[PDB]
Amino acid sequence: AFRVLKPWWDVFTDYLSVAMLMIGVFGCTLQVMQDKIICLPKRVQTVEMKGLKTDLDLQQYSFINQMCYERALHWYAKYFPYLVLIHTLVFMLCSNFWFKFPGSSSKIEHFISILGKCFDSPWTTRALSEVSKKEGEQAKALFEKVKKFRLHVEEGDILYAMYVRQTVLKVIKFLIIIAYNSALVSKVQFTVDCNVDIQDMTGYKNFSCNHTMAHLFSKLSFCYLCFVSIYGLTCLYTLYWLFYRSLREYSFEYVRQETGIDDIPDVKNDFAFMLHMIDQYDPLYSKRFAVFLSEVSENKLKQLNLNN
Amino acid sequence: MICLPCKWVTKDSCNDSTGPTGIKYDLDRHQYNYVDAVCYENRLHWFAKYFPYLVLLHTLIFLACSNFWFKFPRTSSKLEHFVSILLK
Amino acid sequence: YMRQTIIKVIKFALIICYTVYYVHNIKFDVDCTVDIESLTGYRTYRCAHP
Amino acid sequence: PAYRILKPWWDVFTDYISIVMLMIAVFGGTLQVDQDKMICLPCKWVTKDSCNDSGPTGIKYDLDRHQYNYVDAVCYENRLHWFAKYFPYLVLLHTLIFLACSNFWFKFPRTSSKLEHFVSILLKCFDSPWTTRALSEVLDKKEGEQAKALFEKVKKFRTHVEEGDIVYRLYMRQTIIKVIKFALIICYTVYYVHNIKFDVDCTVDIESLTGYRTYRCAHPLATLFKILASFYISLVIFYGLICMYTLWWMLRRSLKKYSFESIREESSYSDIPDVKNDFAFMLHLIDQYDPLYSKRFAVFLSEVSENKLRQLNLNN
Amino acid sequence: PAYRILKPWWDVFTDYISIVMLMIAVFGGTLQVDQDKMICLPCKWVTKDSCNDSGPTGIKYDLDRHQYNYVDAVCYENRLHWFAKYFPYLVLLHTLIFLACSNFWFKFPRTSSKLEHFVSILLKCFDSPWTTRALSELDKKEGEQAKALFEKVKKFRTHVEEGDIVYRLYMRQTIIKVIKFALIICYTVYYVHNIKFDVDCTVDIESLTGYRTYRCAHPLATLFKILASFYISLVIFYGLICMYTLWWMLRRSLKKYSFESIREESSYSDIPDVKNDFAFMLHLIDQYDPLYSKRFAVFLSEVSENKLRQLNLN
Amino acid sequence: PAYRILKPWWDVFTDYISIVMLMIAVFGGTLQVDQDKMICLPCKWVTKDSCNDSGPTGIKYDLDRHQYNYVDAVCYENRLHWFAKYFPYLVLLHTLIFLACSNFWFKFPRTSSKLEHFVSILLKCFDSPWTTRALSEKEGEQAKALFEKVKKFRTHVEEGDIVYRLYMRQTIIKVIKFALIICYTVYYVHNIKFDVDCTVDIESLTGYRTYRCAHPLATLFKILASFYISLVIFYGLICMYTLWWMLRRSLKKYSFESIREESSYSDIPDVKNDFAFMLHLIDQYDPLYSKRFAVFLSEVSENKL
């Protein structure tokens, strides 16, 4: 399971995307059956009031309705749910870009495996208590696994970079969505004026229409806009965390303060980035792995193993 | 929202003033539908229009609040580990 | 857990305030004066919300 | 499922695309079944059976609602183009044929038995402890006997599948059929996608029943049937592109011979002979999903590893 | 499922064809429930109780909406061919009959028990380590399981060879499917042409409506014709597959199974000649995969028993 | 589930008829909900409180659409036969009672527990391999424990015959319900007619006394009714046969004469009550299981053990 490598912002955006998809599905269902426009001709033909007679059949009324729905209504009011569905599917597909890559997922599985193994390894806690047999053999095997992982992962540079690409893509898509939604959210209005030229068919050329689902689509548009705004603040803070502190280098000086050992080489590049990930998840794993990263700790372990 | 016009009005208010005969309004079906839509949008209270959506939103907030610590990973890790060690 | 309980109780307070304040506005008969005389011919309509 | 190891990235991408076109099919079918009508109004003034198109008062056509429904039905069935009426059903049929072509490898029993046996032995080798021990290069006696047994299964399965090439031929056949079908869909759809129009003039000659000769209809779900079709086309293109890549992957390398040169060089056992035909193609697909499965299964195919296990079991 | 090994390519192809036929049957049924009607307009001008059909102004038929609904219902009941009305129920019933005929193999308790117990023996023989050792040519527990499975194999051979109920059941199911295909094809091909868009109904409701003859447009007529053509094509495929299955049963005696090829290729040359119902099941498992039969047949040789008893003692 | 062994051909095949009766009940109920109406047109020429039935132009009735709807509702309620209106609900009710009567055998906790224990130990005795050596005429401890379990179950089950009497009662209920269903359905199937003549006396509200209505879902209902009858007929035949079978011989007295004559162990006594009936059902499903289980019921097989 890679949910351990998933931070809180990723799962927050996941539930936000699920809510966005639900909003899009609801809007599409509204558009399928409840979406209709009602058009009445303009300039027809204690007091008493008499109704204005338009002299129009039901079929002329339906023709006016759909002729003004196709033309007079703004395209945003007609295709807002479909745009929401498309954008939320792109968001969901992009949300696990950094998760779905084959080599990246292999590196993530290897990293979570070694970190869980050293967390389950008694020698981590034993050495942490000491500074501040069979299990020694397993500790030495885990330490050479640590060295193998250092030689296999640390030299690469794909993880932080491609995470930055994913965050930048999310921020850009958020900005585009917010810009176009704020530009076209005033188009969704209840009463519209339709000026199609069907005078040869219905006798009238100017109609006043109302879009019956304009209020609900406006509320749905504002709800989706606020959801996208929250998504964008999440991605902006993610960008701030990515760029403010260099995740190309992880300083183990806090372990140097806690653990008496000082010959701890600072990890670099993807090792630093993934240790930043797990520190956001649980810093105890990082400070417990740092004593398994020092080669002086390896020399001491070799000395104790030779003594045993 | 089935809307019927007031034939006799007195300053924006219905006056409410041998067999009985039905009142002829001379309104088409589509004029009636237009009146329904306009009065439904304008005069019927927002609570009667958005009550189920408000209820759904409140339930979603309540369910998110109840299940937040199960999905928040910093507490989810502790809860899962505690569950595993307690059953075991 | 404390924060979740606090948020739930204040949410309950807000809901049980505004819902009970606006629950009497769900009426059957509603009079509408929407001023569409130029299209329909009347001004005031007595609607019934089913 | 348990067959995901034989499904490469292009296969799962085609599966996702076909799922989306199934969604298109169900959406268009629901729309066509429920709300697909055709409101037609008579042209009151006609010049040579063509609409003249010459406060204002409404035009009285003197037609009942049932006459209007009759006009709508006749001008929907006689003058609206067949593509606009049957686009979602064609989409569903093509999606079903694409899924059938994808799973004809999956359901046809003659190749299905080989796939089950290959997946079962691969999963056994993945979970075999002596496989991990040999990859690392003292055992349980029963575990050693089972390891020698799985060696024998590897040899007999080699003799079983190397004699035939129906699996590779089947996969190539479905790839070719998918490419040809995608070409046909793209051609006929780009031909007929412009026939979906909003305003359609109809001339049905029902003047004896309604009193009018020519009418003008406005098909409601036209533009929404337009863009969907266009977007449908887009998905098909991607499908075809993916399929074409698979066709390229059919001819870039000979899948009937898959060499072990990289595996034996990195491993200690530099003795393994190459595989052929269905075994070679299936190992190619395994490499497409993950080379680790093939490299791990390589230690159960060599004779030096057989001798090493025999000596170990003598010690064990 | 467990009976997947007993389903050859013809059976699974007929299963998918039946699933598709059921899908189009449900589609047509929902269509006929919801959107099926006929829009009927009276013929204003008549010639001997027919339709004379002699700016333009619309014809005033002076009929209410309910008179039109009555005309539609009466003409739909009286003058519209029964095929165009009950085609979805016909394809649904035929598909259900085909599916029941195909799945009656696994539901009749005698044959169901025979196939299930056969499947269990075949599976545990495929997973039997002594099968592996016999193919190559011993723990005491594995030897005990091997002896138990050998006894189960021979007692099954005694139990199933006495009567061929499974072979007769499968032959009768195939015969019924072929006959049903033939009947469906003749009557459907004969009756497709009666699904027309325009139908003239002379239903004599002049006392209630005022008109005698009416012209009706059937909206779900071209759709029903297309579905009928699709159903005809599917039944063509089903019938060709069933005819191949019948030819497969009839060309060679499936009640006899010569083990000469396997006993010649494999080391054991004493393999008995399986006959009657067991021969039919072994032909089915051959049609699935010859490897299953090859890895099960090592338990039928009496020579392997002698090797198994000797290795059990050793 | 685990009760497939206790389901002979009559049980499974009538269950299939029971599941296909339910489909036409749901299909009919959907039809009754959606478009079960009556299009009623007034008879302008009326003679002796009936329709006189005495270019062309349409007949003006001067009736509103709502007057037509009121006429439809009143004549559908008063002058449509109740069989036509409530056929799908009656079919659903009969099918639900059939399902309840065929599954209360497995849902009643007494018989449920007894059948579950019989099935469990029959399966675990079928998994036992020592029956092979028995019928040929740590593993030993397992066979002895299963022998003890079989004997102690027999001493518990052979005392009473609750399962047999409950199965008899269920089958008798099924056959009498089939008889009632086929009788009343044959009686009332002809009342489903397309055209009907309603006379409701609403002249005050409409202006006409007699109307001639058309019921759209009549012929469909008619053929559905015929289909239902066919299914019921088939069902009854199977139930009839079940009666004959359960009255052919003493189902409460299972004799192991053939098995103990074929095998060496001739000490097998005659089984009585629920164990006897359940072994009879086993023989019906598969004679192999009863023969294979019979050796552990014999004490000289324990003498071999």
From Swiss-Prot, chain A:
Effect of L58R: No effect on channel activity of the complex with LRRC8A
Transmembrane regions: 8-33, 78-97, 164-185, 216-240
Intrachain disulfide bonds: C39-C209, C68-C194
Tissue spec. comment: Expressed at very low levels in adipose tissue.
Induction / repression: Induced during the earliest stages of adipogenesis.
Signal peptide boundaries: none
UniProt subcellular location: Cell membrane; Endoplasmic reticulum membrane
Knockout or disruption consequences: Mice do not show remarkable changes in body weight or the weight of white adipose tissue on a chow diet, but display significantly lower body weights and fat mass than wild-type mice when fed a high-fat diet. Moreover, improved insulin resistance induced by the high-fat diet is observed.
Extracellular side: 186-215
Assembly: Heterohexamer; oligomerizes with other LRRC8 proteins (LRRC8A, LRRC8B, LRRC8D and/or LRRC8E) to form a heterohexamer. Homoheptamer; inactive, likely because it is not targeted to the plasma membrane in the absence of LRRC8A. In vivo, the subunit composition may depend primarily on expression levels, and heterooligomeric channels containing various proportions of the different LRRC8 proteins may coexist.
Domain notes: The volume-regulated anion channel (VRAC) channel forms a trimer of dimers, with symmetry mismatch between the pore-forming domain and the cytosolic LRR repeats, a topology similar to gap junction proteins. The cytoplasmic N-terminus preceding the first transmembrane (residues 1-22) regulates volume-regulated anion channel (VRAC) conductance, ion permeability and inactivation gating.
Biological role stated in the UniProt entry: Non-essential component of the volume-regulated anion channel (VRAC, also named VSOAC channel), an anion channel required to maintain a constant cell volume in response to extracellular or intracellular osmotic changes. The VRAC channel conducts iodide better than chloride and can also conduct organic osmolytes like taurine. Plays a redundant role in the efflux of amino acids, such as aspartate and glutamate, in response to osmotic stress.
Family under the similarity heading: Belongs to the LRRC8 family.
Protein name (Swiss-Prot/TrEMBL): Volume-regulated anion channel subunit LRRC8C
From Swiss-Prot, chain E:
Disruption phenotype: Increased prenatal and postnatal mortality, growth retardation, and multiple tissue abnormalities. B-cell development is slightly impaired, without affecting B-cell function. Mice however show a cell-autonomous early block in thymocyte development and impairs peripheral T-cell expansion and function. Conditional deletion in germ cells leads to abnormal sperm and male infertility: the cytoplasm of late spermatids appears swollen, preventing reduction of the cytoplasm during further development into spermatozoa.
Keywords: Acetylation, Cell membrane, Differentiation, Disulfide bond, Glycoprotein, Ion channel, Ion transport, Leucine-rich repeat, Lysosome, Membrane, Phosphoprotein, Repeat, Spermatogenesis, Transmembrane, Transmembrane helix, Transport
PTM per Swiss-Prot/TrEMBL: N-glycosylated.
Tissues/organs with expression: Ubiquitously expressed. High levels detected in the bone marrow; lower levels found in peripheral blood cells. Highly expressed in pancreatic beta cells.
Topological domains, Extracellular: 34-85, 193-222
Cystine bridges: C40-C216, C43-C51, C75-C201
Regions crossing the membrane: 9-33, 86-104, 171-192, 223-247
Entry-listed glycosylation sites: N52
Primary subcellular site in the record, as a coarse category: membrane
Compartments it resides in: Cell membrane; Lysosome membrane
Any one GO MF annotation of this record: identical protein binding
Site residues (Required for anion selectivity), renumbered to this chain: R65
GO biological process, any: chloride transmembrane transport
Effect in UniProt of substituting V26D: Abolishes activity in hypotonic solution
GO cellular component, one term: plasma membrane
Superkingdom field: Eukaryota
Annotated phenotype, changing T30D: Abolishes activity in hypotonic solution
Oligomer and partners: Heterohexamer; oligomerizes with other LRRC8 proteins (LRRC8B, LRRC8C, LRRC8D and/or LRRC8E) to form a heterohexamer. Can form homohexamers in vitro, but these have lower conductance than heterohexamers. In vivo, the subunit composition may depend primarily on expression levels, and heterooligomeric channels containing various proportions of the different LRRC8 proteins may coexist. Interact with GRB2. Interacts with NOX4; this interaction prevents the ubiquitin-mediated degradation of LRRC8A.
Domain comment, as recorded: The volume-regulated anion channel (VRAC) channel forms a trimer of dimers, with symmetry mismatch between the pore-forming domain and the cytosolic LRR repeats, a topology similar to gap junction proteins. The di-leucine motif is required for lysosomal localization.
Illness the protein is tied to: Defects in Lrrc8a are the cause of ebouriffe (ebo), a spontaneous mutation that causes male sterility. Spermatozoa present in the epididymis display severe malformations, mostly of the tail. A drastic decrease of the spermatid population is observed, whereas spermatogonia and spermatocytes seem moderately affected. Defects are caused by decreased volume-regulated anion channel (VRAC) activity in germ cells. Oogenesis is not affected but embryos derived from ebo/ebo females show early developmental failure.
Protein family according to the UniProt entry: Belongs to the LRRC8 family.
